[PDB]
Design a protein around this nucleic acid. Structure first.
Ligand SMILES: [Mg+2]
Lengths: 232, 443, 76, 166, 86, 43, 122, 58
DNA sequence: TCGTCTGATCTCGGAA
DNA sequence: TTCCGAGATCAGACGAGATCGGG
RNA sequence: CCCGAU
């Protein structure tokens, strides 16, 4: 409880949320489904840099009620964050110049990082790209649940959102799921199929099964969404 | 003893300079330290450290000796540096015991540190002739007569043989014929002689005038045959006492013999152990008389009577009320004069015990007051350090409005009130330090 | 010249760390980008095209150093 | 005037990464050390040259580039042996005010040493008679910060004779 | 509350004080020598000078300081009146 | 003891809020912009 | 911003003037209004400074003169500060060297002082 | 607790750039990390980086 | 809640 | 006889996952 | 402190 072991090392953290988890196999291993209501609250200060000027202008007209939007603008010189609810958003949209900060919502393609609270090894914090889905559960792919040691029996796990752009790359490169597929005790892979996928693919690759071009093009064409829809 | 080191920083700052103080005071703070290590830790260039140690070995403040590494570790003796405070008093008793010539002998011996005979007689042949009448030139032969006359009573002793180590360089220490041999002053002989004035003033202001003179002539014929480490003087017979009396006296042998057995049997007790032990308590008693009035001084003498009989008699043995007395005890306790309750033998209980008895311990009350008197002269000099740098504009105008001159005579009233008061607390140091040295074995 | 000629995962992270934060303060972009608004996605386009104005100062632990251009390294 | 070798850690913000450093540091250092007296140094003016520019770090925070810069800048500091030429931009009864031409109106001469026809009697009398020359005499600067001017000078006028103008 | 008013006192005045400038007559002799040697110890050869002032001065120029009967007869006597130790 | 500790490791750089030197803070980064130690002017 | 070297003066008025003349006309080539909301003190000092130096007719003053005058100066034995005064002051007439000039005492001789007038006029 | 004592002693080690593994105070613990300087993470089965039968058939 | 390490007194034993 | 040093025998310490939720 | 979640 003292300042050393609990206020200097283990200190509480802003831009961080916590829900109950539920599965979603229809995501890539690298993505967590974040609820809308959470993604409208957790914000990333994205500075305006000649490439996101039209993108941040488009989203600051939405404001803090439509999801791809924002809820704070700092001006270029430490002006107090302008809670973008009361004023004219279009007058703040047009007056938005280079340099200043927009605290846009947690949008898809942003880097959040999980944690399951009894952290026992390196793999309990992992980064994830964030896709804003429609629910209030943190939904991830079930292959990445044995690193978290997370079953879906009512388990909760935290979601931090790194603010600076330097801490965004340190999540993506070092702690991404595409990087930490392999535990550092053995070298074994920890992210691999669990439960149904194993007993699915065993029952499919079993010697007895035979599919006609009816079922064969149906099972195969399941694998064509989400970076996979553009392959012959 | 940090306040002691506060003075050695102050005493060298006023006399020689600032870096000779800095390299000096650091050597008091880190001790046996080589030449390169001193220049690296004080952040001083090596050319200035060689000069600063050169002045410091001249005035005999830093002593050098090598043991094992073949590299000389300089070392400064702390208690010598405070003897600079007594320097004009060392001048004066050579005017009461010798002429103006020999008084100037110990002066330039104290000033320029190490001197040969061939130089110091040549210097006083300049200073004494320039103040005497031209054409009536002071002849230097009388100087050489009074020069040895100091040495037969052993007021000036010679320097110990130089180590002449390779690291030490002979050419730099002398300041630029005959070589000769060097000496400092024997200030240790003075600390006998200053003690000789101390006991003779202790008897004359207590017993009688004729009692003190036979103490003086006892001690004047016991000078060479003792040292400062003598626990008491050499034993004498009463028959050479009648031989050694001055010619001013006319007392018959048998009446002074009655005073001789009177003076031998006192509460004071020549026991040089008991003499400085009795003079130190009067120095303590004159401080509580200075500070807490005669009423608290009355109970301060009461604990010097009974060792551990207190608080069940001190309300009775001085008859002063219990309210007024017990604030005097706790003020003597909080200022560390009353020492403490070293008799409580009930186990670990402030409330339930065998009743704590006050008891003065003479040395803990001594070493504090010496540490206090070291602190005192720090507050004296720093004020005279303070009032000097402002008023420099009008010292050279004489070399002027009505408040301009009035600031000078209030300055010169102040400095002369400060500088006289550096010496009046200085006599408390020696009166207590000689008591400190008298109870210190293996030194 | 003596350290590893492979860009470590801790050097790729910080080079992408600060080239993202540089380009999010209107730095000049070196890759004639194609609509990427995430500054981090621009920086990986900078790395793969091997145009990053950054030199890694590699500290040997005695105190000596050894420079390495990000052009002059083998990324994965 | 005197050169002063100085060392500064100059931070270039990352939107100036197009321009060359030795120019874009110089544009910063002029905005850092112009019209500013440095205590015990003098009045800095501009940048003479950048004698040594060392390597551009980029720190874990800012993302900017911090180059430690050795340079030389010309400063204004009279050498206590200069007969300058200024203009009287003011006259006070205790002493005249001279100003070097559009340089600094902060040189305040005390006036006690010129020929025994000396007074300023508040009707703007320069001197009771028998560009203006000046002898800068002492250095005098006071560091301003004191709680939660600054190069003033004292300026003399001896028996120069002043053949052209009295 | 009994003392919760202010700093106890600016100073505490002791009803008894110092006696005097004690030993008044005779320290006129030592007291001038206090100031006499201090006039001569400062103006001695055994002192140091602020050569850091001259390395501080880059204004060095000419015409400034920064730029710029013993009546006795021979004899020789060397006495060992003193110790023969150390 | 007058213990002068430097601030190293990670249990102190996290307490002090310095970027730790273990891992991504081991090295440091330079910039590759147009610069040179130039010639001065003749005085 | 620690100043390592407090002094190093040989900057004759022409040198500083010339640097300023190149600087003033060079800063405007890149003169910026983005930095106006930041810094503008530099402009004022350089601008006004040019005028005071301009007072001395360094207009028509040449770079070679610095060495040419210096070659004559070394023979006179005047100190470096004195010569800078001699170039910067540019004593127009003998009276300034005769009286205003520094170190008049002793070194005047009514010989090289007359020669100096020929050198200063040159 | 045993996780806490372990990581509160072992946290300030990193393999420096000349392949040595030192403490925070500069003192060397290992001269190469683990004799070969190899990641256990990337390490193949049998504590060998290759398992050459698999690579040759691949 | 012992569990641990520390460090503080006693005593039978050898050297001079 | 001496005893100086050393192996033996008590007493005190300050430790003992992580988070989250409500009365 | 209890309770409860994992
Ligand atoms: Mg569970």
């Amino acid at each position: 409880q003292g300042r050393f072991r609990g206020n200097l090392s283990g200190k509480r953290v802003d831009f961080s949320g916590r829900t109950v988890i539920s599965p979603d196999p229809n995501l890539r291993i690298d993505e967590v489904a974040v609820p809308v209501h959470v993604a409208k609250i957790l914000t990333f200060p994205e500075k305006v840099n000649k490439a996101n000027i039209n993108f941040l202008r488009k989203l600051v007209q939405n404001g803090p009620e439509v999801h791809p939007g924002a809820n704070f603008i700092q001006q270029r010189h430490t002006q107090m964050k302008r809670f973008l609810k009361y004023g004219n958003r279009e007058k703040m949209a047009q007056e938005l110049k280079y340099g200043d900060i927009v605290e846009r919502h947690l949008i898809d393609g942003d880097v959040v990082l999980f944690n399951r609270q009894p952290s026992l090894h390196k793999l309990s914090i992992m980064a994830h790209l964030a896709r804003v889905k429609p629910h209030r559960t943190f939904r991830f792919n079930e292959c990445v649940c044995t690193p978290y040691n997370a079953d879906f029996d009512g388990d909760e796990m935290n979601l931090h959102l790194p603010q600076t752009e330097e801490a965004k790359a340190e999540a993506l490169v070092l702690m991404g799921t595409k990087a930490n597929l392999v535990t550092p005790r053995n070298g074994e892979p920890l992210i691999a199929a669990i439960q149904d996928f194993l007993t699915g693919a065993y029952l499919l690759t079993l010697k007895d099964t035979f599919f006609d071009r009816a079922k064969a093009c149906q099972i195969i064409a399941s694998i064509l969404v989400g970076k996979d829809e553009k392959i012959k | 003893t940090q306040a002691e080191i506060k003075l050695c920083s102050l005493l060298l700052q006023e006399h020689f300079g600032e870096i000779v103080e800095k390299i000096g005071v650091h050597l008091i703070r880190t001790g046996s330290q080589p030449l390169r290590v001193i220049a690296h830790d004080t952040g001083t260039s090596l050319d200035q450290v060689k000069k600063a140690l050169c002045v410091l070995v001249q005035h005999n403040l830093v002593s050098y000796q090598v043991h094992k590494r073949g590299v000389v570790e300089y070392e400064a003796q702390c208690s010598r540096v405070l003897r600079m405070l007594r320097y004009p008093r060392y001048i004066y008793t050579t005017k009461t015991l010798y002429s103006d010539t020999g008084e100037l002998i110990v002066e330039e011996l104290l000033l320029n540190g190490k001197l040969t005979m061939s130089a110091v007689v040549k210097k006083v042949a300049d200073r004494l002739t320039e103040t005497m009448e031209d054409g009536k030139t002071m002849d230097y032969a009388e100087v050489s007569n009074t020069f040895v006359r100091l040495a037969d009573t052993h007021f000036v002793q010679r320097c110990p043989s130089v180590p002449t180590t390779e690291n030490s360089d002979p050419g730099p220490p002398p300041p630029a014929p005959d070589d000769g041999i060097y000496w400092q002053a024997n200030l240790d002989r003075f600390h006998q002689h200053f003690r000789d004035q101390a006991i003779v003033s202790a008897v004359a202001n207590r017993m009688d005038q004729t009692s003190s003179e036979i103490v003086r002539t006892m001690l004047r014929m016991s000078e060479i045959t003792t040292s400062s480490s003598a626990p008491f003087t050499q034993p004498l017979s009463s028959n050479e006492i009648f031989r050694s009396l001055p010619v001013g006296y006319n007392i018959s042998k048998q009446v002074l013999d009655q005073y001789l057995t009177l003076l031998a049997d006192d509460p004071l007790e020549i026991n040089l152990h008991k003499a400085l032990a009795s003079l130190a308590t009067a120095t303590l008693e004159s401080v509580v008389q200075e500070r807490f009035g005669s009423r608290c001084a009355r109970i301060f003498r009461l604990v010097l009577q009974k060792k551990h009989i207190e608080q069940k008699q001190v309300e009775d043995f001085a008859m002063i009320p219990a309210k007024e007395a017990k604030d005097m005890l706790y003020k003597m306790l909080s200022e560390n004069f009353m020492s403490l309750q070293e008799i409580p033998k009930t186990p670990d209980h402030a409330p339930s015990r065998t009743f704590y008895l006050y008891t003065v311990n003479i040395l803990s009350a001594a070493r504090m007051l010496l540490h206090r008197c070291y602190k005192s002269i720090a507050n004296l000099i720093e004020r005279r350090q303070f009032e000097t740098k402002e008023n420099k504009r009008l010292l050279e105008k004489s070399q002027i409005t009505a408040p301009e001159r009035q600031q000078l005579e209030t300055l010169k009233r102040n400095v002369n009130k400060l500088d006289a008061s550096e010496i009046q607390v200085d006599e408390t140091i020696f009166l207590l330090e000689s008591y400190i040295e008298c109870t210190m074995k293996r030194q | 010249r003596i350290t590893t000629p492979y860009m470590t995962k801790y050097e790729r992270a910080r080079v992408l760390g600060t080239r993202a934060l540089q380009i999010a303060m209107c730095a000049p972009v070196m890759v004639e980008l194609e609509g990427e608004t995430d500054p981090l996605l621009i920086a990986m386009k900078e790395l793969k095209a091997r145009k990053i104005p950054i030199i890694i100062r590699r500290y040997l632990p005695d105190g000596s150093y050894e420079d390495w251009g990000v052009d002059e390294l083998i990324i994965t | 005037f005197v050169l002063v070798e100085m060392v500064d850690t100059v931070r270039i913000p990352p939107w100036q990464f197009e321009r060359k450093l030795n120019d874009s540091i110089a544009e910063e250092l002029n905005k850092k050390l112009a019209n500013k007296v440095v205590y015990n140094v003098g009045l800095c003016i501009c940048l003479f040259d950048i004698t040594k520019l060392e390597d551009a770090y980029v720190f874990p925070g800012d993302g900017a580039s911090h180059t430690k810069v050795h340079f030389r800048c010309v400063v204004f500091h009279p050498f206590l042996d200069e007969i300058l030429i200024g203009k009287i931009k003011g006259c006070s009864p205790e002493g005249v005010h001279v100003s070097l031409g559009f340089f600094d109106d902060i040189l305040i001469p005390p006036e006690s040493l010129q020929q025994p026809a000396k007074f300023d009697e508040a009707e703007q009398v320069w001197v009771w008679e028998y560009g203006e020359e000046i002898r800068f005499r002492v250095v005098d600067e006071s560091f301003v910060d004191t709680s939660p001017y600054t190069l003033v000078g004292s300026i003399s006028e001896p028996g120069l004779g002043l053949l052209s103008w009295w | 509350f009994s003392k919760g008013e202010k700093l106890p006192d600016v100073v505490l005045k002791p009803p008894p004080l110092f006696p005097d400038t004690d030993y008044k007559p005779v320290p006129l002799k030592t007291g001038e020598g206090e100031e006499y040697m201090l006039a001569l110890k400062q103006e001695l050869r055994e002192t140091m000078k602020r050569m850091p002032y001259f390395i501080e001065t880059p204004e060095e120029r000419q015409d400034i300081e920064r730029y710029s009967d013993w009546r006795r007869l021979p004899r020789e006597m060397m006495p060992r009146n003193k110790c023969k130790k150390a | 003891f007058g213990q002068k500790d430097s601030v190293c490791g990670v249990s102190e750089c996290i307490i002090m809020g310095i970027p730790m030197n273990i891992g991504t803070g081991l090295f440091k980064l330079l910039h590759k912009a147009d610069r040179d130690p130039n010639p001065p002017k003749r005085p | 911003m620690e100043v390592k070297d407090a002094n190093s003066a040989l900057l004759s008025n022409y040198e500083v003037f010339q640097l300023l003349t190149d600087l003033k006309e060079q800063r405007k080539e890149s003169g910026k209004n983005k930095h106006s909301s930041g810094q503008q003190n530099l402009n004022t000092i350089t601008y006004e400074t040019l005028k005071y130096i301009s007072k001395t007719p360094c207009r028509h003053q040449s770079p070679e003169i610095v060495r040419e005058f210096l070659t004559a100066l070394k023979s006179h034995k005047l100190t470096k500060a004195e010569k800078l005064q001699l170039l910067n002051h540019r004593p127009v007439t003998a009276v300034e060297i005769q009286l205003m000039v520094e170190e008049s005492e002793e070194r005047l001789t009514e010989e090289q002082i007359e020669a100096l007038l020929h050198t200063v006029t040159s | 607790y045993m996780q806490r004592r372990l990581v509160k002693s072992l946290e300030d080690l990193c393999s420096q750039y000349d392949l040595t593994v030192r403490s925070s105070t500069g003192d060397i613990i290992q001269f190469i990390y683990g004799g070969d300087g190899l990641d256990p993470a990337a390490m193949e089965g049998k504590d060998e980086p290759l398992e050459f039968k698999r690579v040759l058939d691949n």
